[PDB]
Amino acid sequence: YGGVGLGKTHLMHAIGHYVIDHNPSAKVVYLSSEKFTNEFINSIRDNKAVDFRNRYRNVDVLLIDDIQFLAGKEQTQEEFFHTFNTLHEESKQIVISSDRPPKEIPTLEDRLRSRFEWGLITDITPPDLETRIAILRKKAKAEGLDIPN
DNA sequence: TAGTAGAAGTAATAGTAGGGCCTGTGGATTTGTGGATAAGT
Numbered sequence A: 001y002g003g004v005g006l007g008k009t010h011l012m013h014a015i016g017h018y019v020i021d022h023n024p025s026a027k028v029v030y031l032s033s034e035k036f037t038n039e040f041i042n043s044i045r046d047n048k049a050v051d052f053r054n055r056y057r058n059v060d061v062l063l064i065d066d067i068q069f070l071a072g073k074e075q076t077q078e079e080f081f082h083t084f085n086t087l088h089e090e091s092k093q094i095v096i097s098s099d100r101p102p103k104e105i106p107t108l109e110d111r112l113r114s115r116f117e118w119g120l121i122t123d124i125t126p127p128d129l130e131t132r133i134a135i136l137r138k139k140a141k142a143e144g145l146d147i148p149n
Numbered sequence B: 001t002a003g004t005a006g007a008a009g010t011a012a013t014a015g016t017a018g019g020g021c022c023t024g025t026g027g028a029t030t031t032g033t034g035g036a037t038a039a040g041t
Protein backbone atom coordinates (compact mmCIF):
# COMPACT_ATOMS: atom_id res chain seq x y z
CA TYR A 1 0.00 0.00 0.00
CA GLY A 2 1.06 3.59 -0.50
CA GLY A 3 0.39 6.82 -2.31
CA VAL A 4 -0.33 7.14 -6.01
CA GLY A 5 2.60 7.44 -8.39
CA LEU A 6 4.83 5.76 -5.80
CA GLY A 7 6.09 2.62 -7.56
CA LYS A 8 3.77 -0.28 -6.69
CA THR A 9 2.96 -1.33 -10.26
CA HIS A 10 6.64 -0.95 -11.12
CA LEU A 11 7.51 -3.18 -8.15
CA MET A 12 5.19 -6.02 -9.05
CA HIS A 13 5.90 -5.81 -12.76
CA ALA A 14 9.48 -6.30 -11.62
CA ILE A 15 8.35 -9.32 -9.60
CA GLY A 16 6.64 -10.79 -12.65
CA HIS A 17 9.68 -10.16 -14.84
CA TYR A 18 11.98 -11.77 -12.27
CA VAL A 19 9.77 -14.84 -11.91
CA ILE A 20 9.40 -15.30 -15.67
CA ASP A 21 13.12 -14.80 -16.32
CA HIS A 22 14.29 -17.21 -13.62
CA ASN A 23 11.51 -19.74 -14.33
CA PRO A 24 9.99 -19.89 -17.83
CA SER A 25 7.37 -22.54 -17.00
CA ALA A 26 5.65 -20.30 -14.43
CA LYS A 27 2.22 -18.87 -15.26
CA VAL A 28 2.51 -15.35 -13.83
CA VAL A 29 -0.69 -13.34 -14.30
CA TYR A 30 -0.92 -9.62 -13.58
CA LEU A 31 -4.08 -7.51 -13.71
CA SER A 32 -6.15 -4.83 -12.00
CA SER A 33 -9.16 -5.37 -9.75
CA GLU A 34 -11.25 -3.47 -12.31
CA LYS A 35 -10.39 -6.04 -14.97
CA PHE A 36 -10.92 -8.82 -12.42
CA THR A 37 -14.47 -7.64 -11.76
CA ASN A 38 -15.19 -7.04 -15.45
CA GLU A 39 -14.05 -10.55 -16.41
CA PHE A 40 -15.87 -12.11 -13.45
CA ILE A 41 -19.20 -10.45 -14.27
CA ASN A 42 -18.91 -11.07 -18.01
CA SER A 43 -18.17 -14.74 -17.30
CA ILE A 44 -21.31 -14.92 -15.16
CA ARG A 45 -23.39 -13.27 -17.88
CA ASP A 46 -22.06 -15.50 -20.68
CA ASN A 47 -21.95 -18.78 -18.68
CA LYS A 48 -18.14 -18.66 -18.75
CA ALA A 49 -17.77 -19.04 -14.98
CA VAL A 50 -15.96 -22.38 -15.24
CA ASP A 51 -13.44 -20.84 -17.64
CA PHE A 52 -12.92 -17.83 -15.36
CA ARG A 53 -12.19 -20.19 -12.46
CA ASN A 54 -9.88 -22.26 -14.67
CA ARG A 55 -7.86 -19.22 -15.77
CA TYR A 56 -7.53 -17.65 -12.33
CA ARG A 57 -7.33 -20.52 -9.82
CA ASN A 58 -4.38 -22.20 -11.57
CA VAL A 59 -1.83 -19.38 -11.96
CA ASP A 60 1.58 -19.84 -10.37
CA VAL A 61 1.82 -16.16 -9.34
CA LEU A 62 -1.03 -13.64 -9.19
CA LEU A 63 -0.57 -9.85 -9.17
CA ILE A 64 -3.46 -7.50 -8.35
CA ASP A 65 -3.67 -3.71 -8.74
CA ASP A 66 -5.64 -1.37 -6.49
CA ILE A 67 -7.73 -3.92 -4.63
CA GLN A 68 -9.58 -0.91 -3.17
CA PHE A 69 -11.76 -1.17 -6.27
CA LEU A 70 -13.35 -4.26 -4.70
CA ALA A 71 -14.81 -2.11 -1.93
CA GLY A 72 -18.57 -1.80 -2.32
CA LYS A 73 -18.75 -4.97 -4.46
CA GLU A 74 -20.01 -8.02 -2.58
CA GLN A 75 -19.97 -10.90 -5.06
CA THR A 76 -16.64 -9.92 -6.62
CA GLN A 77 -15.18 -9.77 -3.11
CA GLU A 78 -16.52 -13.27 -2.42
CA GLU A 79 -15.10 -14.59 -5.70
CA PHE A 80 -11.70 -13.06 -4.94
CA PHE A 81 -11.92 -14.54 -1.44
CA HIS A 82 -12.36 -18.00 -2.95
CA THR A 83 -9.60 -17.39 -5.51
CA PHE A 84 -7.26 -16.31 -2.70
CA ASN A 85 -8.21 -19.39 -0.69
CA THR A 86 -7.58 -21.80 -3.57
CA LEU A 87 -4.26 -20.19 -4.49
CA HIS A 88 -3.01 -20.11 -0.88
CA GLU A 89 -4.10 -23.74 -0.39
CA GLU A 90 -2.23 -24.77 -3.56
CA SER A 91 0.87 -23.01 -2.14
CA LYS A 92 0.78 -20.44 -4.94
CA GLN A 93 1.90 -16.80 -4.68
CA ILE A 94 -0.49 -13.85 -4.32
CA VAL A 95 0.64 -10.22 -4.44
CA ILE A 96 -1.80 -7.37 -3.78
CA SER A 97 -1.33 -3.62 -4.08
CA SER A 98 -3.56 -0.89 -2.66
CA ASP A 99 -3.46 2.76 -1.59
CA ARG A 100 -4.82 2.04 1.91
CA PRO A 101 -3.94 -0.70 4.42
CA PRO A 102 -6.53 -3.49 4.69
CA LYS A 103 -7.65 -2.24 8.12
CA GLU A 104 -9.20 0.88 6.57
CA ILE A 105 -10.75 -0.52 3.37
CA PRO A 106 -14.50 0.09 3.75
CA THR A 107 -17.13 -2.56 3.02
CA LEU A 108 -14.61 -5.38 3.43
CA GLU A 109 -15.52 -8.66 5.10
CA ASP A 110 -13.50 -9.65 8.14
CA ARG A 111 -12.42 -12.88 6.44
CA LEU A 112 -10.81 -10.88 3.62
CA ARG A 113 -9.37 -8.36 6.08
CA SER A 114 -7.79 -11.18 8.10
CA ARG A 115 -6.45 -12.86 4.96
CA PHE A 116 -4.83 -9.59 3.86
CA GLU A 117 -3.03 -9.20 7.21
CA TRP A 118 -1.96 -12.87 7.19
CA GLY A 119 1.38 -12.25 5.46
CA LEU A 120 3.62 -9.22 5.09
CA ILE A 121 2.21 -5.71 4.64
CA THR A 122 4.56 -3.12 3.14
CA ASP A 123 4.13 0.63 2.77
CA ILE A 124 5.46 3.15 0.24
CA THR A 125 6.08 6.77 1.24
CA PRO A 126 6.80 9.81 -0.95
CA PRO A 127 10.46 9.97 -2.00
CA ASP A 128 13.01 12.41 -0.65
CA LEU A 129 15.37 14.69 -2.56
CA GLU A 130 18.26 12.28 -3.11
CA THR A 131 16.09 9.52 -4.55
CA ARG A 132 14.13 12.06 -6.61
CA ILE A 133 17.38 13.17 -8.24
CA ALA A 134 18.41 9.52 -8.62
CA ILE A 135 15.09 8.61 -10.28
CA LEU A 136 15.45 11.53 -12.67
CA ARG A 137 19.05 10.52 -13.41
CA LYS A 138 17.91 6.96 -14.17
CA LYS A 139 15.17 8.17 -16.52
CA ALA A 140 17.55 10.60 -18.26
CA LYS A 141 20.25 7.94 -18.72
CA ALA A 142 17.73 5.42 -20.06
CA GLU A 143 16.32 7.97 -22.51
CA GLY A 144 19.77 9.11 -23.64
CA LEU A 145 20.07 12.80 -22.75
CA ASP A 146 22.70 14.83 -20.88
CA ILE A 147 21.39 17.38 -18.36
CA PRO A 148 23.14 19.51 -15.71
CA ASN A 149 23.04 18.69 -12.02
C1' DT B 1 -33.47 -37.13 -16.47
C1' DA B 2 -33.51 -34.47 -12.03
C1' DG B 3 -31.48 -31.27 -11.50
C1' DT B 4 -27.25 -23.94 -10.47
C1' DA B 5 -25.00 -19.55 -7.67
C1' DG B 6 -24.25 -15.36 -9.28
C1' DA B 7 -23.19 -7.71 -10.66
C1' DA B 8 -20.73 -2.56 -10.63
C1' DG B 9 -22.88 1.41 -12.05
C1' DT B 10 -25.52 8.66 -13.81
C1' DA B 11 -24.99 14.61 -14.58
C1' DA B 12 -28.09 17.44 -14.21
C1' DT B 13 -34.33 23.17 -12.82
C1' DA B 14 -36.02 28.37 -13.57
C1' DG B 15 -39.33 29.92 -10.88
C1' DT B 16 -43.98 34.15 -6.10
C1' DA B 17 -47.40 38.87 -4.72
C1' DG B 18 -48.40 39.83 -0.49
C1' DG B 19 -48.79 41.92 6.12
C1' DG B 20 -50.53 47.49 9.51
C1' DC B 21 -48.63 49.74 12.25
C1' DC B 22 -48.02 50.92 18.06
C1' DT B 23 -44.17 54.15 17.45
C1' DG B 24 -41.15 58.92 15.16
C1' DT B 25 -37.75 62.49 13.35
C1' DG B 26 -36.94 65.26 8.93
C1' DG B 27 -38.47 68.34 6.08
C1' DA B 28 -41.58 70.54 2.62
C1' DT B 29 -45.55 73.32 2.16
C1' DT B 30 -48.95 76.04 2.39
C1' DT B 31 -50.27 79.36 4.15
C1' DG B 32 -51.02 83.96 7.77
C1' DT B 33 -47.98 87.97 9.49
C1' DG B 34 -45.46 91.39 8.70
C1' DG B 35 -42.93 94.42 5.74
C1' DA B 36 -41.91 96.85 1.33
C1' DT B 37 -43.89 99.67 -2.28
C1' DA B 38 -46.63 102.35 -5.85
C1' DA B 39 -50.09 105.76 -6.18
C1' DG B 40 -53.35 109.16 -5.70
C1' DT B 41 -55.15 112.32 -3.63
Ligand SMILES: Nc1ncnc2c1ncn2[C@@H]1O[C@H](COP(=O)(O)OP(=O)(O)OP(=O)(O)O)[C@@H](O)[C@H]1O
Pocket (backbone or CB within 6 Å): A003, A004, A005, A006, A007, A008, A009, A010, A011, A065, A066, A097, A135
Ligand atom coordinates in the same frame (compact mmCIF):
# COMPACT_ATOMS: atom_id res chain seq x y z
N1 LIG C 1 12.42 4.09 -7.17
C1 LIG C 1 11.21 4.40 -7.65
N2 LIG C 1 10.19 4.53 -6.78
C2 LIG C 1 8.98 4.84 -7.26
N3 LIG C 1 8.61 5.05 -8.52
C3 LIG C 1 9.64 4.92 -9.36
C4 LIG C 1 10.94 4.60 -9.02
N4 LIG C 1 11.74 4.55 -10.15
C5 LIG C 1 10.92 4.84 -11.12
N5 LIG C 1 9.63 5.06 -10.72
C6 LIG C 1 8.50 5.42 -11.59
O1 LIG C 1 7.41 5.82 -10.79
C7 LIG C 1 6.25 5.81 -11.65
C8 LIG C 1 5.01 5.56 -10.82
O2 LIG C 1 4.10 4.75 -11.59
P1 LIG C 1 3.44 3.45 -10.99
O3 LIG C 1 2.81 2.64 -12.05
O4 LIG C 1 4.51 2.71 -10.20
O5 LIG C 1 2.39 4.01 -9.93
P2 LIG C 1 1.57 3.43 -8.69
O6 LIG C 1 1.56 4.36 -7.55
O7 LIG C 1 2.13 2.06 -8.38
O8 LIG C 1 0.12 3.22 -9.31
P3 LIG C 1 -0.77 2.06 -9.97
O9 LIG C 1 -0.80 0.85 -9.10
O10 LIG C 1 -2.15 2.70 -10.17
O11 LIG C 1 -0.15 1.81 -11.34
C9 LIG C 1 6.52 4.77 -12.74
O12 LIG C 1 6.39 5.35 -14.03
C10 LIG C 1 7.96 4.30 -12.47
O13 LIG C 1 8.70 4.24 -13.69
Ligand SMILES: [Mg+2]
Pocket (backbone or CB within 6 Å): A009
Ligand atom coordinates in the same frame (compact mmCIF):
# COMPACT_ATOMS: atom_id res chain seq x y z
MG1 LIG D 1 0.53 2.88 -13.81
